[PDB]
Amino acid sequence: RHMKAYMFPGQGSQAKGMGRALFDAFPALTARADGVLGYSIRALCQDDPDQRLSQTQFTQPALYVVNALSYLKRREEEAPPDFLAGHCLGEFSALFAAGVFDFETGLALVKKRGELMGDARGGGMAAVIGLDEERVRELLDQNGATAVDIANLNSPSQVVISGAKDEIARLQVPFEAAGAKKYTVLRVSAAFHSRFMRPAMVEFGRFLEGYDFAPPKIPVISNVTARPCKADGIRAALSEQIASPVRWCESIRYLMGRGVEEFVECGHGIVLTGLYAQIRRDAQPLV
Protein backbone atom coordinates (compact mmCIF):
# COMPACT_ATOMS: atom_id res chain seq x y z
CA ARG A 1 0.00 0.00 0.00
CA HIS A 2 1.52 3.31 -1.32
CA MET A 3 0.21 6.71 -2.17
CA LYS A 4 -1.15 6.37 -5.72
CA ALA A 5 -2.73 8.09 -8.62
CA TYR A 6 -4.70 6.75 -11.53
CA MET A 7 -4.26 8.31 -14.90
CA PHE A 8 -6.88 7.89 -17.70
CA PRO A 9 -5.96 8.43 -21.47
CA GLY A 10 -7.84 10.48 -24.04
CA GLN A 11 -8.06 11.03 -27.80
CA GLY A 12 -5.05 9.69 -29.63
CA SER A 13 -4.70 6.63 -27.38
CA GLN A 14 -7.51 4.51 -28.90
CA ALA A 15 -6.81 1.41 -31.10
CA LYS A 16 -8.78 -1.30 -32.93
CA GLY A 17 -9.10 -4.17 -30.44
CA MET A 18 -9.08 -2.05 -27.28
CA GLY A 19 -11.16 -3.41 -24.45
CA ARG A 20 -11.66 -7.05 -25.51
CA ALA A 21 -11.04 -8.94 -22.22
CA LEU A 22 -12.85 -6.08 -20.38
CA PHE A 23 -16.06 -6.56 -22.33
CA ASP A 24 -16.05 -10.26 -21.57
CA ALA A 25 -15.38 -9.57 -17.94
CA PHE A 26 -18.19 -6.92 -17.69
CA PRO A 27 -21.15 -8.11 -19.79
CA ALA A 28 -23.67 -6.20 -17.69
CA LEU A 29 -22.00 -2.76 -17.96
CA THR A 30 -21.28 -3.39 -21.68
CA ALA A 31 -25.02 -3.88 -22.21
CA ARG A 32 -25.86 -0.66 -20.25
CA ALA A 33 -23.27 1.23 -22.46
CA ASP A 34 -24.95 -0.15 -25.63
CA GLY A 35 -28.27 1.18 -24.19
CA VAL A 36 -26.90 4.71 -23.82
CA LEU A 37 -25.17 4.72 -27.18
CA GLY A 38 -27.68 3.01 -29.48
CA TYR A 39 -25.05 0.75 -31.08
CA SER A 40 -22.58 -1.93 -29.91
CA ILE A 41 -19.54 -0.57 -28.03
CA ARG A 42 -17.89 -3.95 -28.46
CA ALA A 43 -18.32 -4.00 -32.23
CA LEU A 44 -17.01 -0.40 -32.47
CA CYS A 45 -13.91 -1.17 -30.34
CA GLN A 46 -13.11 -4.68 -31.63
CA ASP A 47 -14.03 -4.39 -35.43
CA ASP A 48 -13.58 -0.58 -35.96
CA PRO A 49 -16.08 -0.58 -38.78
CA ASP A 50 -15.36 2.21 -41.28
CA GLN A 51 -12.49 3.27 -38.99
CA ARG A 52 -15.11 4.98 -36.77
CA LEU A 53 -12.61 4.92 -33.85
CA SER A 54 -10.79 7.76 -35.54
CA GLN A 55 -13.99 9.86 -35.70
CA THR A 56 -14.39 11.91 -32.53
CA GLN A 57 -18.12 11.21 -32.16
CA PHE A 58 -17.18 7.53 -31.69
CA THR A 59 -13.66 7.88 -30.31
CA GLN A 60 -14.90 9.55 -27.15
CA PRO A 61 -17.37 6.90 -25.98
CA ALA A 62 -14.92 4.22 -26.91
CA LEU A 63 -12.28 5.65 -24.57
CA TYR A 64 -14.84 6.35 -21.82
CA VAL A 65 -16.08 2.76 -21.83
CA VAL A 66 -12.68 1.05 -21.90
CA ASN A 67 -11.29 3.49 -19.27
CA ALA A 68 -14.25 2.96 -16.92
CA LEU A 69 -14.08 -0.82 -17.19
CA SER A 70 -10.28 -0.76 -16.72
CA TYR A 71 -11.01 1.19 -13.53
CA LEU A 72 -13.61 -1.27 -12.14
CA LYS A 73 -11.33 -4.23 -12.95
CA ARG A 74 -8.45 -2.62 -11.09
CA ARG A 75 -10.78 -1.87 -8.20
CA GLU A 76 -11.59 -5.59 -7.86
CA GLU A 77 -8.00 -6.20 -6.80
CA GLU A 78 -6.92 -3.01 -5.03
CA ALA A 79 -7.92 -0.12 -2.83
CA PRO A 80 -9.01 3.06 -4.45
CA PRO A 81 -6.36 5.55 -5.49
CA ASP A 82 -5.51 8.71 -3.50
CA PHE A 83 -5.82 11.00 -6.55
CA LEU A 84 -7.26 10.82 -10.05
CA ALA A 85 -6.27 12.58 -13.24
CA GLY A 86 -7.62 12.21 -16.74
CA HIS A 87 -5.86 13.46 -19.87
CA CYS A 88 -8.18 15.27 -22.22
CA LEU A 89 -11.15 12.95 -22.83
CA GLY A 90 -9.90 10.93 -19.87
CA GLU A 91 -10.92 13.71 -17.43
CA PHE A 92 -14.45 12.28 -17.75
CA SER A 93 -13.18 8.88 -16.54
CA ALA A 94 -11.48 10.49 -13.51
CA LEU A 95 -14.78 12.29 -12.64
CA PHE A 96 -16.66 9.02 -12.98
CA ALA A 97 -14.11 7.27 -10.72
CA ALA A 98 -14.54 10.11 -8.27
CA GLY A 99 -18.34 9.73 -8.12
CA VAL A 100 -19.16 13.06 -9.66
CA PHE A 101 -21.56 11.11 -11.95
CA ASP A 102 -22.38 7.51 -12.57
CA PHE A 103 -21.22 5.34 -15.44
CA GLU A 104 -24.09 5.86 -17.82
CA THR A 105 -24.52 9.61 -17.14
CA GLY A 106 -20.80 10.22 -17.97
CA LEU A 107 -21.25 8.13 -21.10
CA ALA A 108 -24.21 10.37 -22.09
CA LEU A 109 -22.03 13.46 -21.62
CA VAL A 110 -19.22 12.05 -23.71
CA LYS A 111 -21.61 11.06 -26.45
CA LYS A 112 -22.91 14.60 -26.62
CA ARG A 113 -19.39 16.03 -26.39
CA GLY A 114 -18.30 13.82 -29.33
CA GLU A 115 -21.27 14.88 -31.49
CA LEU A 116 -20.48 18.57 -30.85
CA MET A 117 -16.81 18.27 -31.58
CA GLY A 118 -17.70 16.21 -34.71
CA ASP A 119 -19.41 19.18 -36.25
CA ALA A 120 -16.25 21.33 -36.03
CA ARG A 121 -14.40 21.88 -39.41
CA GLY A 122 -11.35 23.85 -40.61
CA GLY A 123 -9.07 22.95 -37.70
CA GLY A 124 -5.92 21.03 -37.15
CA MET A 125 -3.33 20.02 -34.64
CA ALA A 126 0.34 19.04 -34.58
CA ALA A 127 2.56 17.24 -32.00
CA VAL A 128 5.94 18.71 -31.54
CA ILE A 129 8.99 17.06 -29.91
CA GLY A 130 12.02 18.90 -28.56
CA LEU A 131 10.88 22.42 -27.78
CA ASP A 132 9.60 23.71 -24.46
CA GLU A 133 6.42 25.68 -23.99
CA GLU A 134 8.10 29.06 -24.10
CA ARG A 135 10.07 28.30 -27.25
CA VAL A 136 6.95 27.04 -28.92
CA ARG A 137 5.02 30.22 -28.10
CA GLU A 138 7.86 32.40 -29.37
CA LEU A 139 8.18 30.47 -32.66
CA LEU A 140 4.38 30.64 -33.20
CA ASP A 141 4.32 34.43 -32.70
CA GLN A 142 7.47 34.95 -34.77
CA ASN A 143 5.69 33.08 -37.65
CA GLY A 144 2.55 35.18 -37.39
CA ALA A 145 0.61 32.34 -35.78
CA THR A 146 -1.12 34.28 -33.05
CA ALA A 147 -4.34 32.30 -33.52
CA VAL A 148 -2.61 28.99 -32.94
CA ASP A 149 -2.77 27.70 -29.32
CA ILE A 150 -0.67 25.29 -27.31
CA ALA A 151 -3.43 22.66 -26.77
CA ASN A 152 -1.51 20.06 -24.70
CA LEU A 153 1.51 20.56 -22.40
CA ASN A 154 2.29 16.82 -22.16
CA SER A 155 5.84 16.60 -20.86
CA PRO A 156 9.04 18.81 -20.85
CA SER A 157 9.75 18.00 -24.47
CA GLN A 158 6.19 17.27 -25.88
CA VAL A 159 3.49 19.82 -26.69
CA VAL A 160 0.52 19.78 -29.03
CA ILE A 161 -0.44 22.88 -31.01
CA SER A 162 -3.81 23.61 -32.28
CA GLY A 163 -5.25 25.98 -34.85
CA ALA A 164 -6.39 26.66 -38.47
CA LYS A 165 -5.66 23.65 -40.68
CA ASP A 166 -3.50 25.51 -43.29
CA GLU A 167 -1.52 27.29 -40.62
CA ILE A 168 -0.68 24.00 -38.80
CA ALA A 169 0.55 22.53 -42.15
CA ARG A 170 2.70 25.50 -42.96
CA LEU A 171 4.31 25.79 -39.56
CA GLN A 172 6.05 22.37 -40.09
CA VAL A 173 9.14 23.63 -41.97
CA PRO A 174 9.84 26.61 -39.82
CA PHE A 175 9.51 24.49 -36.58
CA GLU A 176 11.83 21.82 -38.16
CA ALA A 177 14.29 24.57 -39.18
CA ALA A 178 14.25 26.00 -35.61
CA GLY A 179 15.01 22.65 -33.96
CA ALA A 180 11.70 20.80 -33.45
CA LYS A 181 13.07 17.20 -33.43
CA LYS A 182 9.78 16.09 -34.76
CA TYR A 183 6.54 17.74 -36.11
CA THR A 184 3.49 15.64 -36.95
CA VAL A 185 0.19 16.97 -38.34
CA LEU A 186 -2.52 14.93 -36.67
CA ARG A 187 -5.48 13.34 -38.31
CA VAL A 188 -8.10 15.57 -36.73
CA SER A 189 -10.47 18.11 -38.46
CA ALA A 190 -10.83 20.41 -35.44
CA ALA A 191 -8.47 22.55 -33.38
CA PHE A 192 -9.26 20.68 -30.12
CA HIS A 193 -8.30 22.49 -26.84
CA SER A 194 -7.96 25.83 -28.62
CA ARG A 195 -10.01 29.01 -28.39
CA PHE A 196 -11.66 28.01 -31.73
CA MET A 197 -13.66 25.45 -29.71
CA ARG A 198 -15.60 28.19 -28.03
CA PRO A 199 -18.85 27.25 -29.86
CA ALA A 200 -18.72 23.68 -28.64
CA MET A 201 -17.87 24.92 -25.11
CA VAL A 202 -20.85 27.19 -24.93
CA GLU A 203 -23.29 24.59 -26.29
CA PHE A 204 -21.81 21.93 -23.97
CA GLY A 205 -22.24 24.20 -20.93
CA ARG A 206 -25.78 24.72 -21.98
CA PHE A 207 -26.33 20.91 -22.32
CA LEU A 208 -24.78 20.36 -18.89
CA GLU A 209 -27.48 22.56 -17.23
CA GLY A 210 -29.83 19.63 -17.46
CA TYR A 211 -27.46 17.46 -15.32
CA ASP A 212 -26.55 17.42 -11.60
CA PHE A 213 -23.03 16.69 -10.46
CA ALA A 214 -21.73 15.54 -7.01
CA PRO A 215 -18.57 16.79 -5.46
CA PRO A 216 -15.66 14.42 -6.05
CA LYS A 217 -15.10 11.83 -3.36
CA ILE A 218 -11.39 11.52 -4.45
CA PRO A 219 -9.56 14.56 -5.75
CA VAL A 220 -9.54 14.99 -9.47
CA ILE A 221 -6.68 17.11 -10.88
CA SER A 222 -8.22 19.39 -13.42
CA ASN A 223 -6.65 19.75 -16.94
CA VAL A 224 -7.53 23.47 -16.82
CA THR A 225 -5.92 24.51 -13.54
CA ALA A 226 -3.42 21.60 -12.80
CA ARG A 227 -5.09 21.56 -9.31
CA PRO A 228 -7.88 19.62 -7.58
CA CYS A 229 -11.40 20.33 -9.04
CA LYS A 230 -13.47 22.43 -6.69
CA ALA A 231 -16.52 20.87 -4.99
CA ASP A 232 -18.68 23.10 -7.23
CA GLY A 233 -18.62 24.99 -10.51
CA ILE A 234 -17.84 21.58 -12.00
CA ARG A 235 -20.09 22.04 -15.00
CA ALA A 236 -18.43 25.33 -15.83
CA ALA A 237 -14.98 23.77 -15.55
CA LEU A 238 -15.78 20.74 -17.74
CA SER A 239 -17.19 23.02 -20.49
CA GLU A 240 -14.12 25.27 -20.21
CA GLN A 241 -11.79 22.25 -20.54
CA ILE A 242 -13.02 21.82 -24.16
CA ALA A 243 -11.47 25.17 -25.20
CA SER A 244 -8.56 25.38 -22.75
CA PRO A 245 -5.08 23.98 -22.85
CA VAL A 246 -4.45 20.67 -21.06
CA ARG A 247 -1.86 21.31 -18.38
CA TRP A 248 -0.73 17.70 -18.00
CA CYS A 249 2.87 18.09 -17.21
CA GLU A 250 2.07 20.50 -14.31
CA SER A 251 -0.72 18.13 -13.02
CA ILE A 252 1.68 15.27 -12.73
CA ARG A 253 4.41 17.44 -11.02
CA TYR A 254 1.72 18.61 -8.61
CA LEU A 255 0.85 15.04 -7.69
CA MET A 256 4.53 14.21 -7.16
CA GLY A 257 4.79 17.32 -4.92
CA ARG A 258 1.75 16.04 -2.99
CA GLY A 259 3.58 12.77 -2.22
CA VAL A 260 2.28 10.37 -4.85
CA GLU A 261 4.56 7.24 -5.06
CA GLU A 262 2.76 5.24 -7.74
CA PHE A 263 1.24 6.30 -11.01
CA VAL A 264 -1.05 3.78 -12.70
CA GLU A 265 -2.53 4.20 -16.23
CA CYS A 266 -6.16 2.82 -16.46
CA GLY A 267 -7.38 2.31 -20.01
CA HIS A 268 -5.97 1.09 -23.27
CA GLY A 269 -2.24 1.68 -24.16
CA ILE A 270 0.81 3.25 -22.58
CA VAL A 271 0.51 6.85 -23.63
CA LEU A 272 0.36 8.33 -20.11
CA THR A 273 2.86 5.79 -18.69
CA GLY A 274 5.40 7.13 -21.17
CA LEU A 275 4.63 10.75 -20.35
CA TYR A 276 4.83 10.07 -16.67
CA ALA A 277 8.28 8.49 -17.16
CA GLN A 278 9.48 11.60 -19.08
CA ILE A 279 8.18 13.99 -16.41
CA ARG A 280 9.66 11.89 -13.51
CA ARG A 281 12.97 11.44 -15.33
CA ASP A 282 13.29 15.15 -15.96
CA ALA A 283 12.90 15.75 -12.21
CA GLN A 284 15.55 13.13 -11.36
CA PRO A 285 19.26 13.68 -12.01
CA LEU A 286 21.09 10.78 -13.83
CA VAL A 287 23.69 8.79 -11.88
Ligand SMILES: *CC(=O)NCCNC(=O)CCNC(=O)[C@H](O)C(C)(C)COP(*)(=O)O
Ligand atom coordinates in the same frame (compact mmCIF):
# COMPACT_ATOMS: atom_id res chain seq x y z
C1 LIG B 1 -5.23 15.14 -25.37
C2 LIG B 1 -5.79 15.77 -26.60
O1 LIG B 1 -6.02 16.97 -26.71
N1 LIG B 1 -6.08 14.81 -27.49
C3 LIG B 1 -6.46 15.06 -28.88
C4 LIG B 1 -5.14 15.50 -29.64
N2 LIG B 1 -4.12 14.49 -29.59
C5 LIG B 1 -3.99 13.45 -30.45
O2 LIG B 1 -4.73 13.30 -31.39
C6 LIG B 1 -2.80 12.50 -30.28
C7 LIG B 1 -1.46 13.26 -30.73
N3 LIG B 1 -0.31 12.45 -30.39
C8 LIG B 1 0.50 12.72 -29.30
O3 LIG B 1 0.40 13.72 -28.56
C9 LIG B 1 1.64 11.69 -29.10
O4 LIG B 1 1.87 10.86 -30.28
C10 LIG B 1 1.36 10.74 -27.92
C11 LIG B 1 0.02 10.00 -28.07
C12 LIG B 1 1.42 11.63 -26.64
C13 LIG B 1 2.44 9.60 -27.92
O5 LIG B 1 3.80 10.03 -27.90
P1 LIG B 1 4.69 9.85 -29.26
O6 LIG B 1 4.16 9.43 -30.55
O7 LIG B 1 5.98 10.43 -29.04
